[PDB]
Design a protein around this motif. Sequence first.
Motif, mmCIF file in Angstrom:
data_model
loop_
_atom_site.group_PDB
_atom_site.id
_atom_site.type_symbol
_atom_site.label_atom_id
_atom_site.label_comp_id
_atom_site.label_asym_id
_atom_site.label_seq_id
_atom_site.Cartn_x
_atom_site.Cartn_y
_atom_site.Cartn_z
ATOM 1 N N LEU A 1 -7.216 17.338 -37.071
ATOM 2 C CA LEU A 1 -8.146 16.385 -37.562
ATOM 3 C C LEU A 1 -7.389 15.367 -38.407
ATOM 4 N N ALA A 2 -6.669 15.714 -39.474
ATOM 5 C CA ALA A 2 -6.057 15.054 -40.249
ATOM 6 C C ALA A 2 -5.075 14.090 -39.675
ATOM 7 N N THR A 3 -4.557 14.526 -38.616
ATOM 8 C CA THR A 3 -3.689 13.686 -37.789
ATOM 9 C C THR A 3 -4.463 12.499 -36.976
ATOM 10 N N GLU A 4 -5.755 12.844 -36.551
ATOM 11 C CA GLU A 4 -6.555 12.207 -35.870
ATOM 12 C C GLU A 4 -6.942 11.082 -36.837
ATOM 13 N N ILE A 5 -7.547 11.251 -38.330
ATOM 14 C CA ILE A 5 -7.909 10.169 -39.013
ATOM 15 C C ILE A 5 -6.710 9.176 -39.272
ATOM 16 N N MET A 6 -5.650 9.796 -39.582
ATOM 17 C CA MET A 6 -4.589 9.008 -39.868
ATOM 18 C C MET A 6 -4.095 8.088 -38.920
ATOM 19 N N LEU A 7 -4.193 8.514 -37.337
ATOM 20 C CA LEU A 7 -3.905 7.761 -36.400
ATOM 21 C C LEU A 7 -5.149 6.872 -36.174
ATOM 22 N N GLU A 8 -6.160 7.164 -36.438
ATOM 23 C CA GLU A 8 -7.275 6.075 -36.422
ATOM 24 C C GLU A 8 -7.300 4.903 -37.260
ATOM 25 N N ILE A 9 -7.018 5.445 -38.438
ATOM 26 C CA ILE A 9 -6.925 4.063 -39.315
ATOM 27 C C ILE A 9 -5.592 3.173 -38.948
ATOM 28 N N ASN A 10 -4.678 3.916 -38.736
ATOM 29 C CA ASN A 10 -3.656 2.898 -37.982
ATOM 30 C C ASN A 10 -3.949 2.248 -37.006
ATOM 31 N N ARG A 11 -4.715 2.794 -36.084
ATOM 32 C CA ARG A 11 -5.040 2.099 -34.876
ATOM 33 C C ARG A 11 -6.002 0.938 -35.683
ATOM 34 N N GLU A 12 -6.949 1.265 -36.435
ATOM 35 C CA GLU A 12 -7.770 0.036 -36.929
ATOM 36 C C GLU A 12 -6.979 -1.008 -37.339
ATOM 37 N N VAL A 13 -5.938 -0.682 -38.097
ATOM 38 C CA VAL A 13 -4.900 -2.009 -38.677
ATOM 39 C C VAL A 13 -4.635 -2.700 -37.427
ATOM 40 N N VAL A 14 -3.967 -2.134 -36.435
ATOM 41 C CA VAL A 14 -3.495 -2.580 -35.310
ATOM 42 C C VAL A 14 -4.669 -3.702 -34.852
ATOM 43 N N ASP A 15 -5.916 -3.092 -34.730
ATOM 44 C CA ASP A 15 -6.928 -3.685 -34.112
ATOM 45 C C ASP A 15 -7.154 -5.173 -35.033
ATOM 46 N N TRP A 16 -7.033 -5.100 -36.243
ATOM 47 C CA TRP A 16 -7.290 -6.292 -37.018
ATOM 48 C C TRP A 16 -6.235 -7.024 -37.051
ATOM 49 N N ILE A 17 -4.951 -6.684 -36.786
ATOM 50 C CA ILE A 17 -3.993 -7.486 -36.612
ATOM 51 C C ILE A 17 -4.188 -8.332 -35.443
ATOM 52 N N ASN A 18 -4.532 -7.718 -34.078
ATOM 53 C CA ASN A 18 -4.695 -8.252 -32.997
ATOM 54 C C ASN A 18 -6.263 -9.142 -32.852
ATOM 55 N N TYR A 19 -7.059 -8.909 -33.702
ATOM 56 C CA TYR A 19 -8.200 -9.600 -33.810
ATOM 57 C C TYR A 19 -7.940 -10.933 -34.587
ATOM 58 N N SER A 20 -7.095 -10.891 -35.513
ATOM 59 C CA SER A 20 -6.470 -11.822 -36.274
ATOM 60 C C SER A 20 -5.631 -12.792 -35.844
ATOM 61 N N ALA A 21 -4.844 -12.096 -34.892
ATOM 62 C CA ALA A 21 -3.545 -12.834 -34.553
ATOM 63 C C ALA A 21 -4.015 -14.164 -33.663
#
Lengths: 370, 371
Positions: B161-181
Amino acid sequence: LIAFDICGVQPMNSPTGQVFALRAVYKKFPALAASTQTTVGDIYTHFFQETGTVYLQASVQVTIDAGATDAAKLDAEIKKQMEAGALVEIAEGMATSIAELQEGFNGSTDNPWNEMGFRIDKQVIEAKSRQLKAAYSIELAQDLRAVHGMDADAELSGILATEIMLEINREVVDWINYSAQVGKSGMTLTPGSKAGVFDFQDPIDIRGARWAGESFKALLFQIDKEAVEIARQTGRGEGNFIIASRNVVNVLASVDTGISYAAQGLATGFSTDTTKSVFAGVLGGKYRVYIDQYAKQDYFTVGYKGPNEMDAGIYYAPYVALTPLRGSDPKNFQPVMGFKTRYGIGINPFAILNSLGKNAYFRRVYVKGI
Amino acid sequence: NLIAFDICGVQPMNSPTGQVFALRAVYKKFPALAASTQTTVGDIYTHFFQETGTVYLQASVQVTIDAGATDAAKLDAEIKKQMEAGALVEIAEGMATSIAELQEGFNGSTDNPWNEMGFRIDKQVIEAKSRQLKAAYSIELAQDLRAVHGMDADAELSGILATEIMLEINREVVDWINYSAQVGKSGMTLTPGSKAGVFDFQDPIDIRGARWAGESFKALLFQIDKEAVEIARQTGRGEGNFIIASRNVVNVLASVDTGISYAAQGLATGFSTDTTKSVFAGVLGGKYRVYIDQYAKQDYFTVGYKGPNEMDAGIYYAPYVALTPLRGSDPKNFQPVMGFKTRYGIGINPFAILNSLGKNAYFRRVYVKGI
C-alpha cells in the motif's frame, strides 16, 4: 501603539500563510372559519382581507359567528374577539410551537444525530506589505539638532513609525467597515425607521426623546439591538466592541459616566501624553469602544470578539513590523527614512467579495443628527 | 520507494500553506525594391511579390532590377531571375535583426538604456494537498498468510500500500505535467505535412521517409530534439533535459543509441531479484534523462526542461507529510484496514491551473501512434 484587540491575530512566520475561524455550520395551523368553536389553548390561522395572516390562540372557548360567510364579516368578528382578548396573535413564535409539537409528539429515536452547528474553516493569507517614507530636508534635520538639541531624524522616524502603525489600525477598521453588514435593518428595524441610519433628530429613532440627553441614550439602545443581531447570526454571542467616529464616541461618552476615559490625568497635566490610538473604554459594561481617527463622515459599527484566536470574524496576522528603511534621495541627497510591515488579513469566510456587506460579526450604521 | 520527481523542484514545506518560487522569465522599414533600383551588395530591400506576400532580399550582386518593369508582374519576374542567378537572397527575421542593430547601434546613446535581467521571478502559495489509500483486506488472509507462508500479513500489505500511494502521487505529478504541457509537434516544431501533436510511425512524413524501424526510431528522436529546442526558446533557460514517456515509446527510444537505458541485466540474470520500476530508465542520446510512465493512458512522450536550481523546474511538489499511517476496521464486516496519507502541495510556473492547461513552456507533449 496598536489596536489589534478586536480581531484575531494568529501571527505569521511566513506569508501565505493562513488563518482559521470557528465558522458556524449554517405547520398548517387549522384555519379559523365561521362557526368554528375555538378551544382554549388552540391556535388557528386567519387571513385578514387587509394585512393577511396571523396565528390566533384561543384564551376563550368561542364560536366565531357562524353567520360570517362574508370574509369581511368574519374579519370583523375576529377583530372583536381579539379586542375581547379571546383571540391573540403571534406569528413565527407560534410556528415554532407547532413545529416542536409535531416533531416531538410524533417523533422517534431513529438516528437523528446532528453535527454540532459548526463548520470550522480556514483561509489563505498573504503577508501584504505596507510602507512609508520620511522624505525630509537636510537643513531641517540640521536645525532640529542645532537649534534645540533635538535628535532630528530620530524623532522624524518616531513620527513615521507611529504613522505606519496608525495606517494599519485604519486598514483593519476599513475592512470591518467594508465587510460589516448594514445594521438598523431587517431584524433591527423600528417599523417607522429609515433603514441603516440613526438620526438623532428623528422621533422614531430617538424613541420619543427630548433633547440630546435622551436622544443620546436612544442611540445606545440601537447599539444593543445591533449586538443582538450579531449574536444571533454568528451563533457566538453579543457584540463586544464598537468602532465609531469621534462624534459618535463623544455622544457615547456623554452617558455611562466615566466609562469612556478622557485620560483625565492627561488633561489635568496639560497634555502630558495623548496616546490617541486606544480604546476609550466599555459602554454598558458590554462594549469596548474604539475611536476611528479617520472616520470619513459619521458612523458606528458594533462587532463580536470571542476569547478564541479563531473567533473574531476578522484576523490580523503580523509577519514583519517596523522594519527601518533608510538612505537618501540622490537628486539632492536628502534623507530618507521609512518603515515596512507585512501581515496579511482575513475573515470568517461567510460565503473579499464574500465579506462585503456580509460579515455577521459586525453591523454598520450611518449616523445623522449629532 | 522513489520520488520520480528528480526532474522537478521541491522546495518542501514546513507548514501546509506553504509556498514555492519559480524563475519566471520576464517576457525596420527596409526600403522597398522597385523597378530600376540599383542594388548594392549587402543591402536589403523589401519586396512584395504578387504571389505569397513579401520577402526580404539581400543583394549579393550590385544590379539594377529592370528599370522598365513598371508592371509588378515584370518586377517579380526580374526578381525571380535575379534570385535564380543568386543576385538576390531571401531571409526574413534573420534580416530584421540586422537592420535593427545597425540602426539602433549607430544611432544609440549612453542615455539610461539599462535593461533588466530577463527574469520576473515570483512565488505561489500551495496548500498541503492530501492523498490517501486503504488496504481494504480481510482477516482470513492475514490469518493464513501467517499460518501458511510464515508471512507478516499486515506488514506486507502495508509495504504494498505504501508503494501504491507513492506510485500514485508520482502518477499525479506526471498527469499535471501532461495537463500543463504545451502540445508539441506544433507551430515552431511542425513540418509542412505534419499532423499537429502526434507522431505516427506509419506516416511517411513523421518518419521523414525512413527505412525500417532503425531510421524511423531515430526520426522520433529528431522530433524530440525539435521539442527540446522549442522549450529552450520559450523558457529562455535551454534545451529540455528529460523525457517522460509510455512503455511503447520508451522501448522505441531504447532501441537506438545502444545504451541509453539500463536493461536491468543484473535483475534479469537473477530472475527478477528486485524490479524497482519507479526509476529513470537512463539518458537518451546522453542528452535527456528519461522516465517511464507506467500508467500512460494513450501512448506518448513529453519533453521537458529542468535546471540545477529548484526554482527552475516549471513544476513544483513540496512534501510535507508522507506515509502517515491509518489503522482500524469496518464494523460492517469487521474487516481490517491499514493505510496511508500524504500531504504535499504542488506548483506550476505562473506562465500567465487556469494558466497551466496546455500552456507550460517547460514541457511539450506529443502523442505517438504506429509503434
